[PDB]
Amino acid sequence: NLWVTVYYGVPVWKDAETTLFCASDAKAYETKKHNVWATHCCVPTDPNPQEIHLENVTEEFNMWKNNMVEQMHTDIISLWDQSLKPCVKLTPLCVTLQCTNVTNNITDDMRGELKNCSFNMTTELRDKKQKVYSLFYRLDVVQINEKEYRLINCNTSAITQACPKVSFEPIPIHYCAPAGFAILKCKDKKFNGTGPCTNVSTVQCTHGIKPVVSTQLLLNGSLAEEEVIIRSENITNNAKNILVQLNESVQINCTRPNNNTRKSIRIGPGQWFYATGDIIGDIRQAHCNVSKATWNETLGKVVKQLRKHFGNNTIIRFANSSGGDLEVTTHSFNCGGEFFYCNTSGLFNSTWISNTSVTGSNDSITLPCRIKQIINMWQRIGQAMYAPPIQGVIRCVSNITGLILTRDGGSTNSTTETFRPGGGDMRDNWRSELYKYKVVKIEPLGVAPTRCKRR
Amino acid sequence: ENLWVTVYYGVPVWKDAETTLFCASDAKAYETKKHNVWATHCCVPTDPNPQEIHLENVTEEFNMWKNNMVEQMHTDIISLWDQSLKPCVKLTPLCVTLQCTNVTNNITDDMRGELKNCSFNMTTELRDKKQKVYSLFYRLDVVQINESNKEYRLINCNTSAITQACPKVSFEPIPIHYCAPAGFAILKCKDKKFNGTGPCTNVSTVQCTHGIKPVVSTQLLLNGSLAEEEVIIRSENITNNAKNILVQLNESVQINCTRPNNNTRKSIRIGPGQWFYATGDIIGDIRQAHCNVSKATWNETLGKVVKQLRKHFGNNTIIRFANSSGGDLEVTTHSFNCGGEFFYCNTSGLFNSTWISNTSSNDSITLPCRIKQIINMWQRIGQAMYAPPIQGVIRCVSNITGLILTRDGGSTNSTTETFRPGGGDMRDNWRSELYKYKVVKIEPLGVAPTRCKRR
Amino acid sequence: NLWVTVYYGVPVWKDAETTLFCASDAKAYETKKHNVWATHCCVPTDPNPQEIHLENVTEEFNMWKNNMVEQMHTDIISLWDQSLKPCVKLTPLCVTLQCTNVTNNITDDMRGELKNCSFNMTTELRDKKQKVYSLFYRLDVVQINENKEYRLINCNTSAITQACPKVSFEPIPIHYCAPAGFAILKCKDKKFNGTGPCTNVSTVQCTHGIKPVVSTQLLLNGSLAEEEVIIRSENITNNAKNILVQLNESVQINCTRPNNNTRKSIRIGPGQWFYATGDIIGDIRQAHCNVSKATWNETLGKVVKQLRKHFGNNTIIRFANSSGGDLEVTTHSFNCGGEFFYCNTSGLFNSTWISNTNDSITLPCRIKQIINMWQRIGQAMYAPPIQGVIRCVSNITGLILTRDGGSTNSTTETFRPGGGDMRDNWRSELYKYKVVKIEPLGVAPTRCKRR
Amino acid sequence: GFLGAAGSTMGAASMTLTVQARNLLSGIVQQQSNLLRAPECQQHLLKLTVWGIKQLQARVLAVERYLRDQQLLGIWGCSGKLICCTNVPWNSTWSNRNLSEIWDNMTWLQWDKEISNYTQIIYGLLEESQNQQEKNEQDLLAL
Amino acid sequence: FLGFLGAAGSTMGAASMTLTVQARNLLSGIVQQQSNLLRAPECQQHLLKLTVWGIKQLQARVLAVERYLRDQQLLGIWGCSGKLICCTNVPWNSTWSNRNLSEIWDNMTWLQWDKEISNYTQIIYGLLEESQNQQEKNEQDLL
Amino acid sequence: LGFLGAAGSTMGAASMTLTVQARNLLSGIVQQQSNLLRAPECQQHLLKLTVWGIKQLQARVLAVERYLRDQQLLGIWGCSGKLICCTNVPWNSTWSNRNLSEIWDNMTWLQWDKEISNYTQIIYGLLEESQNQQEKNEQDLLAL
Ligand SMILES: *[C@@H]1O[C@H](CO)[C@@H](O[C@@H]2O[C@H](CO)[C@@H](O[C@@H]3O[C@H](CO[C@H]4O[C@H](CO)[C@@H](O)[C@H](O)[C@@H]4O)[C@@H](O)[C@H](O[C@H]4O[C@H](CO)[C@@H](O)[C@H](O)[C@@H]4O)[C@@H]3O)[C@H](O)[C@H]2NC(C)=O)[C@H](O)[C@H]1NC(C)=O
Ligand SMILES: *[C@@H]1O[C@H](CO)[C@@H](O[C@@H]2O[C@H](CO)[C@@H](O)[C@H](O)[C@H]2NC(C)=O)[C@H](O)[C@H]1NC(C)=O
Ligand SMILES: *[C@@H]1O[C@H](CO)[C@@H](O[C@@H]2O[C@H](CO)[C@@H](O)[C@H](O)[C@H]2NC(C)=O)[C@H](O)[C@H]1NC(C)=O
Ligand SMILES: *[C@@H]1O[C@H](CO)[C@@H](O[C@@H]2O[C@H](CO)[C@@H](O)[C@H](O)[C@H]2NC(C)=O)[C@H](O)[C@H]1NC(C)=O
Ligand SMILES: *[C@@H]1O[C@H](CO)[C@@H](O[C@@H]2O[C@H](CO)[C@@H](O)[C@H](O)[C@H]2NC(C)=O)[C@H](O)[C@H]1NC(C)=O
Ligand SMILES: *[C@@H]1O[C@H](CO)[C@@H](O)[C@H](O)[C@H]1NC(C)=O
Ligand SMILES: *[C@@H]1O[C@H](CO)[C@@H](O)[C@H](O)[C@H]1NC(C)=O
Ligand SMILES: *[C@@H]1O[C@H](CO)[C@@H](O)[C@H](O)[C@H]1NC(C)=O
Ligand SMILES: *[C@@H]1O[C@H](CO)[C@@H](O)[C@H](O)[C@H]1NC(C)=O
Ligand SMILES: *[C@@H]1O[C@H](CO)[C@@H](O)[C@H](O)[C@H]1NC(C)=O
Ligand SMILES: *[C@@H]1O[C@H](CO)[C@@H](O)[C@H](O)[C@H]1NC(C)=O
């Protein structure tokens, strides 16, 4: 005759939704004085938290149902909106522009890229206007059919410029649980994103995931352990996007090589427009260099892994993106305070049967990249962010660590399984890194039979 | 035999109190899909039945004119209404030197001069375009500026800016209940024909009130609840004729109100996602919005009311109903919301009859109703709200369950007492149906003597 | 063999910090009459404030790095900003402003200071402008030239907003109060000087009534020392520190703006009203203050006597006026009646006072309407005018001084005005208090264990 | 029958002490049983700050009341007891009514008014009694 | 050192050891994190620029407090307040689980056991609350 | 006499006053609200939450949590609800080399908890361990 007994402090938990704490390192905080991440995620991280391996435990994970990435998406869009809140609006600028081709020391490829536009802006005094001028990139200007130009979204969207002093540079972030909650981190190597995980450990806060914004390629991210890992909610349904994590990074040397000048024009009391001043030197296209051999070798790895799910008699080809807006067509990113948009068509141009079909030992693939300043962040229609120009010359170096791919259709056994760049979903950008983690609510109370009864 | 202190916990003792009561309602199936504002508010369910525990041998002092409960919910509806209104487009650009003329498009004699075709350059929110814009208005919403025709402004302009109520939000009167937080309780008076003050004979405890439809009205109480088998009259001060007077009816009176004009809307683009809905043309003959009320129903009802009045003021006294005094339409007429529009009805056709000690059909009373699209909601100074137009013909059918009165006494002679419609303060609209209820602080802890001692 | 016992509720504390909650007198609605300090300090005080004496208890205090001053700073900025946020904005009130000097029964000095300025104003309707005029002070308006074109000073960098009318910033005595688990310790050491463990300390529900008074170079409507004059400085030998001086007598000052003013309530937008300065009913005179001269002399005598202490026996001490710079730091800035008085203090600090081997002092004052309070945080708050004549009568309870760089000279140590850090104005009271957190739980040895 | 015995005299009414005491902060379970009232309620509270602070204020006041009462039971040594004798005699100053007259012919409500000016005094006496009792226990452990 | 969830994989009987860690974490985390929030950054002025942040965080904190208070009440109603292990007078039902002491406390983790009898939890609670009342009843008869 | 009145007194003399501090440890909220009853202007002039709005509720919840954390820290050692109680842990001379004549008398609590500051987490852990042992033993003792 066994008897009921109630225990408190039981090691059990459930899946749940909650709110976590955005914490950052103190060094990056104090150095990045005016950055959004440092100041919002002011909570210092544990200088040395203890990870608790869950010996002889098994836990299931499903990174496609993970509430965390949704919360991070909401939090980042909220932070982005909050940073631009006290900055000035550019709706007084929406005036017809008198423009010309700048035509001043320009290479063959950049002809027609830049326009020199003059216009009438409001002064500090509401009864006085000023004739001023600036240079514009052609992606940010549209023509009137009747020299007669406007902005792309002059009469469509509310446009706001970033304040000059605030920084959006990504910094490593840790997400810490509230009390009653813990984070379970899956450490099993070659975890495909679904199912049980043998090597699991409990943590108070995640590691320093850097919240980089990106479209097609995953930058400054984390790497697989031994081999490239391919993960997809459904391997065969092409409706789902395919995530690639490399086991070796790839360096990208990218730049805007134009010694630019930032001018400051008074719109009104305390309102400053930030204009692109005259460029010092010649005018060349921005571009990103990548090692050719490193590139093909990475592609060799990813096709080797892909063949597991489509067969080693299956032709595997990479083509460039399908049409659409620039924001998903290209690879875009905001290193250096200006928004680069890179033609990836040089990449993803091959077919693979037995390694590559195609020396070049010192060859490097050069992606041309457009620039633009008015940005429809998060693919929201009707709102936009004007990046202020950055004086000087922009140089950036980055680690590619993963890719986003999609498959086309076509019902045929002689298919080529055409992979193309995908993405454009910031959720997918988060999900590439934060997959090893889930949150769990601790239920300390339990009941069991026993040898013991109350007297 | 000697007595000692002993602590008694779980003691059914209470006090009168004021507190933060929270709104609840039938969840239904959220079929209003968060369109109506009170499916964004009051979303906690009241789906379980009320407890309804009889307080045997208990009599409870109630005072509906001191019902603070009314005050909290009144404040809550004001705050919610403004908060709903705020995140919408500001029609402040439409406050302009407007040019107007008469419509004269198959208009009946009653509506001559009521509708104006108005136009002006107005605004585009694109610098120096001044695209002409025109629309239709009711004469109540527009006023001459000076001593084509005359310069005109919107009536609101000298008082405050105006906000357009978003078309995606409804203010339909779905019933709501008000549920106590923990530690408190609601006491419901079941003493039928409770005259509004004093002891209530027998009473129940509940967690929530019954379903109250927070209708807005000025003179007549609409879609309300009926008295127990007898017309009832209530007043904070029967003696003082300066107090509002509450009439609760035994039978409901049906009213068929209509705007018969088959009207359309004009969508005007003010700015980036800023859209204004202008009153468009009217298809067909233009007639007057008005209400039909069953004449026999009204006279029988008012005879019953007169009997109840005579209970207090004598059954040989002479009673008269006269119309309200002068003043703005918001207090003089019977005002209400029909599907979003705002009707303002001349109730002088109702409160006209006289009564004497008589013992010691399909004919309808017509009430013409004016239509006004600028609303000073809650009698607020400023904070104007622009009711958008609604397409087509509108027919509202409503239960009149009671009304408000004010008394002109006989003064010196004290032979005849005259009654006129009153109200306009929604506190009185609440108090009519919310009169059985009182919040109570529970105090489960106490002490008492007993022969038993501490062991 | 002694055993562990646990004690809960131990009367101990540690140094602590937390958002103290306000407690107003709540004496009547007339003090709650649209004043921020009462309307928004909704919580009243205990009608009978309590104080518990702590026998044989010594507690260290340091009026510097004392958190509650920073709390008061954050609270004044927050209350100010939220009070004056929902108010009429004058942001479109920037055009070429056409001014001419007024001269009608005016003091030679006021010549130019006041100025009639015709102006193009907006109306309730977007499509109409109206021609208006107003008087302006030269501190408000700047000349722009290629001669009669002018603008407002702040219009090149910041937005101009009115203070809402019928809103009073008249200071009200506030009692800062400790929440649950916290306590306030009050020091009563005579001549405490602001640092070190207090000989006699007492726990108190809330601080005494502190008026959030805004004074510059000196202390107004504050507390008085019990005897002589207290000198306070975080580093007396460092010349970059501000010397807080607390008197045991108050000095009598009467400040006045004599001109009989009138006001025009112009409509600029829907519900937006602008208060313009109409013609002066009376004569034109400069604002000024009368200080009790003999009181001032004996005051400075006490101050110099206390200054000689810790600065050398029979050391020569001299006074001089402030340095140049912006008016908010060079002159006695303060608020009287709702208008901002900017007074020349040079007639107060002068001469040498070693003195070993009745009458009134007049201080002229300017009137400024547009105010950047604190470190350019007010953001062009525009003071509306007040009809009539303005008079205030005040007690100076303390001085803010700074010593020159006379260390290498070793002679004629020269003290000048100080201030500009408004924290001092509250430090001069909040030195008396400290915030602590009760740490009720502890352990100790005993004679016995559990059975 | 929550409060169903309010009109009942004390003797019968005290049989429903469990009934009432069970409802101390039943919102601690009910609100959790209401799934924090809805997902949509959570969205409403975050979207409109005013009811956020209002409903949050309600919850914290309820918790504070719960905890105040619990501490008052604790300091008297009456934790977890619906009833406890306390070693404090009864004063005729408080009620000179017969024990029959108090436990019958009289309801709890009338009694709360009858002792309105003295409950706090009794509470202080209970605090003192329990303090002395705990000190006695310490000494008995010593002896 | 074990860790907060260090016993999750340990067998149920062994996992019954050192329940203190999990009991204490629920509030030690609250106080420690709150201290590392308020001052260690000194940026509450920034975090409270956004009302919604404050509402979210404050709701989460009071919810944690509410969860702990819920558990404390549900232990008190079973007479388990102040104890991490506490027995009753309710016999076990093979309907909930027929396994024996070896089959349950050995070669089984608490997770498996929790999944085994989740759907009977509401039953047991009823019995437990039911049980406690009768003990109080008997005490009330002595009283 | 009143709150902290025995702070300068000896620990033995201040062993009972624990009650006054205890009441305040929660009852400050009573001083904050509900005895310092919220003025009718409260929440109409505190709709501006940034002043004295959220921050007051922060203060209240923080006080509540300090109370709960300490109360749980007591109960997890046993002795729930008791101001004072002994335990089964002997005193280590490492923590303090002082006599009752020197501890209960001649010295105040502030001095004492300063003198045993660094060891606090040590003793607490021992108490926790002690409590745990007892409970398990009793259950098996009650099973046998
Ligand atoms: C992946 O991670 C790598 C890590 O290296 C990133 O690469 C570097 O990122 C930094 C971003 O901080 C690049 O640029 C740096 O920006 C600083 C910002 O300057 C601010 O302050 C001045 C003050 O007047 C303003 O004028 C200016 O507008 C800015 O507001 C610069 O100050 C840095 O220069 C300083 O530090 C470097 C450190 O080596 C020194 O060499 C300089 O002399 C100077 O002291 C710096 O320029 C930096 O250029 C990136 N590296 C390279 C090689 O380009 C990647 O951006 C990141 N990528 C992604 C996708 O996440
Ligand atoms: C993954 O996708 C495949 C198809 O891409 C799914 O297989 C289909 O399942 C449905 C179920 O009714 C069948 O009707 C289809 O005929 C199947 N497709 C093919 C090509 O045979 C599969 O169910 C998906 N699995 C998951 C876990 O999502
Ligand atoms: C993808 O495009 C690149 C060019 O950007 C192709 O490379 C060229 O291929 C042609 C084939 O006739 C050669 O003549 C050129 O010399 C190649 N130039 C470069 C840049 O190497 C590449 O072949 C295309 N993809 C495939 C697999 O055909
Ligand atoms: C007050 O008394 C009336 C009776 O005068 C109660 O009316 C009862 O209502 C219930 C509801 O279902 C019926 O079952 C009974 O039949 C009614 N009584 C009679 C005599 O028919 C009313 O419920 C009482 N109010 C309260 C709160 O207890
Ligand atoms: C400060 O020390 C003095 C003794 O020097 C203490 O004595 C007096 O206390 C009363 C209390 O009302 C004060 O009004 C007097 O000013 C004090 N001084 C004198 C000379 O009478 C006093 O109690 C000490 N303060 C504290 C807080 O302990
Ligand atoms: C591919 O990479 C390898 C290794 O760097 C290199 O030898 C080869 O020339 C590259 N080109 C081909 C064959 O794709
Ligand atoms: C590769 O081909 C061999 C041939 O037998 C086959 O067994 C194996 O499954 C194939 N692998 C893939 C991934 O197609
Ligand atoms: C593959 O070939 C089989 C016959 O061998 C045929 O039935 C099937 O349709 C083919 N698959 C596709 C996708 O065409
Ligand atoms: C201030 O202190 C001096 C020191 O001698 C004394 O003479 C004077 O009377 C004191 N003032 C007051 C008002 O007590
Ligand atoms: C897991 O199983 C092994 C098998 O021997 C056992 O020794 C170990 O203790 C188990 N893990 C835990 C945490 O008990
Ligand atoms: C007790 O007091 C004696 C004499 O004052 C001293 O020698 C001894 O060290 C003290 N004991 C402890 C444990 O401090």
* CA–CA separation, A137 and A378 (whole Å): 21
* CA–CA separation, C205 and C201 (whole Å): 13
**Sign of the C-alpha dihedral computed for residues A129, A133, A138 and A143 taken in this order:** positive
DSSP letters spanning E52-111: HHHHHHHHHHHHHHHHHHHHHHHHHTTT-TT-SEEEEEEEP-TTT----HHHHHSS--HH
Task: Determine, yes or no, domain membership for E72.
Answer: yes
Resolution (A): 4.6
Q: Which amino acid is at C129?
A: K
Structure-token pair, residue C12: 């101990």
Q: Which residues pair with C220 in a beta bridge?
A: C396
Question: Does residue C362 contact residue C347 with C-beta atoms inside 8 Å?
Answer: yes
Strands C243-261 and C287-292: antiparallel
Q: Is A453 in the pocket of ligand 7 (CB under 6 A)?
A: no
Task: Determine, yes or no, domain membership for B454.
Answer: yes
What is the position in ligand 9's atom list of the atom closest to the CA of C224? 13
Decide: helix, strand or coil at residue D114.
Answer: helix
Among C112, C131, C111, CA closest to C121: C131
> Considering its fold, how many domains does chain D have in total?
1
Place of tokens 């809140």: A85
Structure-solving method: cryo-EM
Residues 6+ apart with CB under 8 A from B422: B219, B244, B245, B324, B404, B405, B406
* CA–CA separation, A42 and A26 (whole Å): 8
Going by CA atoms, what residue is nearest to atom 10 of ligand 9?
Answer: C227
Helix (H) or strand (E) holding F5: none
* CA–CA separation, C10 and C12 (whole Å): 6
Q: Which residues line ligand 10 (CB under 6 A)?
A: A 55-56; E 9-11
Residue numbers in F near E14 (CB within 8 A)? none
Going by CA atoms, what residue is nearest to atom 14 of ligand 10?
Answer: E10
Q: Which amino acid is at A144?
A: I
Q: Please state the length of chain C.
A: 451
Question: Does residue B24 contact residue B176 with C-beta atoms inside 8 Å?
Answer: yes
Encode A231-261: b = buried (16+ Cβ within 10 Å), e = exposed.
bbbebeebeebbbbbbeebbebebbbebebe
Task: Determine, yes or no, domain membership for E66.
Answer: yes
Task: Determine, yes or no, domain membership for D3.
Answer: no
> Considering its fold, how many domains does chain B have in total?
1
Task: Determine, yes or no, domain membership for D110.
Answer: yes
Among C367, C378, C385, CA closest to C165: C385
Among C332, C403, C418, CA closest to C368: C332
Task: Determine, yes or no, domain membership for B186.
Answer: yes
What are the backbone angles phi and psi of residue C113, rounded to the nearest 5°?
Answer: -40, -65
Decide: helix, strand or coil at residue E17.
Answer: coil
Closest residue, chain D, to C3 (C-alpha): D142
Question: Does residue D95 contact residue B449 with C-beta atoms inside 8 Å?
Answer: yes
Angle at C248 between CA C246 and CA C252, to 5 degrees: 90
DSSP state of D68: H
Question: Does residue D53 contact residue D36 with C-beta atoms inside 8 Å?
Answer: no
Residues 6+ apart with CB under 8 A from C57: C201, F7, F8
Encode F23-33: b = buried (16+ Cβ within 10 Å), e = exposed.
bbbbbbbebbb
Q: Within 13 Å of residue C245, how many CA atoms lie on the same side as its CB?
A: 30
**Sign of the C-alpha dihedral computed for residues E98, E104, E109 and E111 taken in this order:** positive
Rg for chain A, CA atoms, rounded: 26
Distances (CA, A) of A236 to A242, A407, A414: 10, 9, 16
Cβ contact A94–B128 (<8 Å): no
Place of tokens 């009639």: C116
**Sign of the C-alpha dihedral computed for residues A117, A118, A120 and A121 taken in this order:** positive
Beta strand spans in D1-143 (E): 83-89
Task: Determine, yes or no, domain membership for B95.
Answer: no
3-state secondary structure chain A: CCEEEEECCCCCEEECCCCCEEEECHHHHHHCCCEHHHHHCCEECCCCCCCEECCCCCEEEECCCCHHHHHHHHHHHHHHHHHCCCCCECHHHCCCEEEEECCCCECHHHCCCEEEEEEEEECCCCCCEEEEEEEEEHHHEEECCCCEEEECCCCCCEEEECCCCCECCCCCEEEECCCCEEEEEECCCCCCCEEEECCEEEECECCCECCCCCCCEEECCCCCCCCCEEECCCCCCCCCCEEEEEEEEEEEEEEEEEEEEEEEEEEECCEEEEEEEEEECCECCEEEEEEHHHHHHHHHHHHHHHHHHCCCCCCEEECCCCCCCHHHHCEEECHHHCEEEECHHHCCCEEECCCECCCCCCCEEEEEEEEECEECHHHCCCEEEECCCCCEEEEEEEEEEEEEEEECCCCCCCCCCCEEECCCCHHHHHHHHCCCEEEEEECCCEEEEECCCCC
User: What ligand is nearest to the CA atom of residue B60?
Assistant: 4
* CA–CA separation, B346 and B379 (whole Å): 19
Distances (CA, A) of B273 to B384, C298, D122: 21, 71, 67
C-alpha B135: how far from chain center:
30
Among B171, B167, B161, CA closest to B88: B167
3-state secondary structure chain C: CCEEEEECCCCCEEECCCCCEEEECCCCCCCCCCEHHHHCCCCECCCCCCEEECCCCCEEEECCCCHHHHHHHHHHHHHHHHHHCCCCECCCCCCCEEEEECCCCECCCHHHHEEEEEEEEECCCCCCEEEEEEEEECCCEEEECCCCEEEEHHHHCCCCEECCCCCECCCCCEEEECCCCEEEEEECCCCCCCEEEECCEEEECECCCECCCCECCEEECCCCCCCCEEEECCCCCCCCCCEEEEEEEEEEEEEEEEEEECEEEEEEECCEEEEEECCCCCCECCEEEEEEHHHHHHHHHHHHHHHHCCCCCCCCEEECCCCCCCHHHHCEEEEECCEEEEECCCCCCCCECCCCCCCEEEEEEEEECEECCCCCCCCCEECCCCCEEEEEEEEEEEEEEEECCCCCCCCCEEEEECCCCCHHHHHHHHCCEEEEEECCCEEEEECCCCC
User: What ligand is nearest to the CA atom of residue A195?
Assistant: 2
Among C144, C120, C147, C142, CA closest to C132: C120
Rg for chain C, CA atoms, rounded: 26
What is the position in ligand 8's atom list of the atom closest to the CA of A415? 13
Task: Determine, yes or no, domain membership for B334.
Answer: no
Distance (Å) from CA C55 to ligand 5 centroid: 10
What are the backbone angles phi and psi of residue C172, rounded to the nearest 5°?
Answer: -125, 140
For an interface test with B, the pick among A81, A89, A91 (most B C-beta atoms closer than 10 Å) comes out as A91
Q: Please state the length of chain E.
A: 143
Cβ contact D64–F60 (<8 Å): yes
C-alpha E49: how far from chain center:
35
Burial class for B146, CB neighbours closer than 10 Å (0-12, 13-18, 19+): exposed
Among B389, B424, B415, B121, CA closest to B281: B389
Q: Pick from E20, E51, E58: which is nearest to F128 by CB?
A: E20
Closest residue, chain F, to A451 (C-alpha): F143
Residues 6+ apart with CB under 8 A from F112: C442, C444, F11, F96, F103
* CA–CA separation, B313 and B239 (whole Å): 10
Task: Determine, yes or no, domain membership for B31.
Answer: yes
* CA–CA separation, B183 and D59 (whole Å): 10
Question: Does residue A160 contact residue A81 with C-beta atoms inside 8 Å?
Answer: no
Distance spanning both ends of chain B, measured CA to CA: 16
Among B308, B38, B329, B57, CA closest to B193: B308
Structure-token pair, residue B29: 């199936």
Residue numbers in A near F140 (CB within 8 A)? 451-452
Encode A121-156: b = buried (16+ Cβ within 10 Å), e = exposed.
bbbbbbeeeeebbbbbbbbbbeeeeeeebbbbbbee
* CA–CA separation, C378 and C372 (whole Å): 5
3-state secondary structure chain B: CCCEEEEEECCCCEEECCCCCEEEECCCCCCCCCCEHHHCCCCEECCCCCCCEECCCCCEEEEHHHCHHHHHHHHHHHHHHHHHHCCCCECHHHCCCEEEEECCCCECHHHCCCEEEEEECCCCCCCCCCCCEEEEEEHHHEEECCCCCCEEEEHHHHCCCEEECCCCCECCCCCEEEECCCCEEEEEECCCCCCCEEEECCEEEECECCCECCCCECCEEECCCCCCCCCEEEECCCCCCCCCEEEEEEEEEEEEEEEEEEEEEEEEEEECCEEEEEEEEEECCECCCEEEEEHHHHHHHHHHHHHHHHHHHCCCCEEEECCCCCCCHHHHCEEEEEECEEEEECHHHCCCCEECCCCCCCCEEEEEEEECCEECHHHCCCCEEECCCCCEEEEEEEEEEEEEEEEECCCCCCCEEEEEECCCCHHHHHHHHCCCEEEEEECCEEEEEECCCCC
Task: Determine, yes or no, domain membership for B267.
Answer: no
Residue numbers in A near B128 (CB within 8 A)? 95
Domain assignment of residue D34, given as a range: 10-142
* CA–CA separation, B341 and B344 (whole Å): 10
C-alpha C268: how far from chain center:
33
* CA–CA separation, B310 and B419 (whole Å): 13
- Which CATH number goes with the domain that contains B46? 2.170.40.20
Packed helices F120-143 and E20-38: angle between N→C axes, nearest 10 degrees: 150
Encode C147-184: b = buried (16+ Cβ within 10 Å), e = exposed.
eeebbbbbbbbbbbbbbeeebbbebbbbbbbbbbbbbb
Place of tokens 């990056």: A28
Question: Does residue F115 contact residue F93 with C-beta atoms inside 8 Å?
Answer: no
